[PDB]
Structure 1
Amino acid sequence: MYEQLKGEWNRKSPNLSKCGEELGRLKLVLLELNFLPTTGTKLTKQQLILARDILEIGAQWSILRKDIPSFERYMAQLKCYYFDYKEQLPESAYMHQLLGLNLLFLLSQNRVAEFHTELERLPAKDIQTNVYIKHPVSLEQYLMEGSYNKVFLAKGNIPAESYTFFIDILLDTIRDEIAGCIEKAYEKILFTEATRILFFNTPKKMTDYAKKRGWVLGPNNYYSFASQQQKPEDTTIPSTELAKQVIEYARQLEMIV
């Protein structure tokens, strides 16, 4: 039963004290039931609900320590607690915003098949409840039709500070796409457009990006020149190799009589 292991619920981890106790206590769960390939008598599922909530706080300690494979591994565990063959479970306060966090990292990690199985594993309830689903899926719509306009304005609406950690990863997939989508695809842009979109107005970060294009800047300008050289044609090589395809075409004249 184990009366309450979370006696310091608001004193989660200033150390690794309850993290070591958490490894021991999750191992006690592993000793006791095993996991959930069991039918259960629903009183051994009460400590499985406790196991859900302490794996939620283990996900919080995994994002506290930044162990992302253990974070997403415990997240896959909690999804298997919602893939748990009995839906008849008690209700936790994080029941949908855990799916929200999973959605946000799952969108940041550039997995779109994971995005559609996120919108397909439990489809019908994602529309109305949990604005931490709708604000991310309409935020995906904002990535679809008008990105680089609502990112900071969406960071301005997360009252539950666990989403800014993953939209920092979304800022990284913003900055690499700046690094692929404001130069070496255009003609020239001046310094103030890079000052607006590339914030903090002169770090070594936008300087890192401007030199990360493989390009040297002038004063108050960013040309996007010296690209798409020679007007390439591939002179006569398909003429050769497609006759080398005509070779096995003659082999297809050969295999039949």
Structure 2
Amino acid sequence: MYEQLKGEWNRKSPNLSKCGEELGRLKLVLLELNFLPTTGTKLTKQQLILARDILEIGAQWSILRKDIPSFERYMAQLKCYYFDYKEQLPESAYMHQLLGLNLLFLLSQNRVAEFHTELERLPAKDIQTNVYIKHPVSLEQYLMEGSYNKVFLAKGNIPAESYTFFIDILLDTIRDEIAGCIEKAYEKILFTEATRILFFNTPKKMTDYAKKRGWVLGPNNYYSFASQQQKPEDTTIPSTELAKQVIEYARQLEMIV
């Protein structure tokens, strides 16, 4: 039934708009069925088992076409596919790493509480197996343990069905955090610390780092500023605003008893 849905099955990139022709075909699947309010009788859901599989393959297209609204859109499809109250489904193929994808995308976008509901929704399959989950979570512990070189040890085998864009944005969340943590409370560094913490010896990106943030490129030397803190005294008068506290506070002592 409705065989033309399988028109983009195994080749995965003739074009970008032939996949949009497949978006028209999937749009016909939308006009005809709409899996999510579909209650039961799981033979009207078997072509929706196909829709689960080919919207995994649409997620493969979204990471292929670099589209982040389409990645969160099809990723939210895959989220709603497991949410659907007929959870009694055939075993989803990319289930081990699609959760990884968003998670590493989470690791791309620096979440703080979605990480732990990622730890909450399927905890039991994280320690025992599923290196697409087991590797980014102990890896993510090792990021917040203090190893930026566990990145490069991890990237020895991190393709992981196109986990290349996300590890490039992982390199981004290395380098802009270096743009935070290169002189945070530091004395100074020298060029070899920009060889260690930064990499790729010298691009015009670290020369940009010397010319983007208001940087003192010392002669083989490095400074945030001449003072790094920009003269903190903030008022030099802490007293009069506390007399404003005496204004409203003393008013608060009145009207009550």
Q: Same fold (TM over 0.5)?
A: yes
Question: Which of 8-17 and 103-112 deviates more?
Answer: 8-17
Distance 1:188 1:31 in 2: 62
Shift of 1:4: 6.1
Listed one character per residue, the Cα deviations across residues 58-87 of structure 1 (whole Å, up to 9, x for unaligned) are: 112122222102211210111111111121
Cα shift at 1:184 = 4.9
The 1:206/1:245 distance shift into structure 2, 3 A limit, reads same
Conserved 8 A contact 2:217-2:223: yes
Do the aligned residues in 2 keep the contact of 1:188 with 1:225 (CA within 8 Å)?
A: no
Counterpart contact for 1:184–1:225, Cα < 8 Å: no
Q: Is the Cα contact below 8 Å between 1:29 and 1:35 reproduced in 2?
A: no
After TM superposition, the structure 1 stretch with the greater mean CA deviation from structure 2, 101-110 or 242-251, is 242-251
TM-fit CA distance, 1:107: 1.9
From the superposition, tell whether residues 204 and 194 of structure 1 become closer, same or farther in structure 2 (CA, over 3 Å).
Answer: same
CA distance in 1, matches of 2:225, 2:185: 9
Aligned partner of residue 238 in structure 2, secondary structure: helix
Change (3 A) 1:110 1:176: same
Q: C-alpha distance in 1, partners of 2:4/2:191? A: 58
Q: How far, CA to CA, are the matches of 2:17 and 2:69 in structure 1?
A: 21
Give yes or no for contact 1:142–1:150 (8 Å, CA) kept in 2: yes
TM-superposed CA distance for 1:167, in Å, is 1.4
Please give the per-residue CA displacement for 1:113-171, whole angstroms capped at 9, x wherever unaligned: 11111111122222212111111001111111122121121111125242121111111
Query: Structure 1: how far apart are the matches of 2:245 and 2:136?
Result: 50
Alpha-carbon shift at residue 238 of structure 1 (Å): 3.2
Provide the rounded CA distance (Å) in 1 between the counterparts of 2:229 and 2:68. Answer: 42
Q: 1:13 to 1:51 in 2, by over 3 A?
A: same
Distance 1:219 1:256, change over 3 A: closer
CA 1:179–1:234 in structure 2 vs 1: closer, same or farther (change >3 Å)? closer
Q: Check 1:45–1:142 CA distance in 2 against 1; reply closer, same or farther (3 A cut).
A: same
Instruction: Please show how residues 157-172 of structure 1 align to structure 2 within 5 Å.
Output: 157-172=157-172
Output the CA distance in 1 between the equivalents of 2:141 and 2:246: 48
- 1:235 CA drift (Å): 4.0
Equivalent residues of 2:8, 2:22 under 8 A apart: no
- Does the CA-based 8 Å contact 2:5-2:26 persist in structure 1? no
CA contact (8 A) 1:55 1:74 kept: yes
RMSD, matched Cα: 2.0
Aligned residue pair count: 257
Task: Select between 39-48 and 192-201 the one with higher mean Cα deviation.
Answer: 192-201
Unaligned stretches of 5+ residues in structure 1: none
Between stretches 179-188 and 76-85, larger displacement belongs to 179-188
Q: Partner of 2:153: helix, strand, or coil? A: helix
Find the aligned partners of 1:230 and 1:223 in 2 and give their Cα distance: 13
What is the rounded CA distance, in whole Å, between the counterparts of 2:128 and 2:240 in structure 1?
61
Cα offset, 1:233, TM superposition? 2.5
Which residue matches 1:37? 37
Q: Could you tell me whether the CA contact under 8 Å between 2:100 and 2:132 is conserved in 1?
A: yes
Matched position secondary structure for 1:217: strand
Structure 1 residue 90 displacement after superposition: 0.7
**Contact preservation (8 Å) 1:179, 1:212:** no
Structure 2 gap ranges (5+): none
Alpha-carbon deviation of 1:256? 1.5
8 Å CA contact 2:195, 2:201 repeated in 1: yes
Q: Is residue 104–residue 166 contact of structure 1 (8 Å, CA) maintained in 2? A: yes
Using the TM superposition, name which of 158-167 and 100-109 deviates more.
Answer: 158-167
What is the Cα deviation at residue 255 of structure 1?
Answer: 2.0
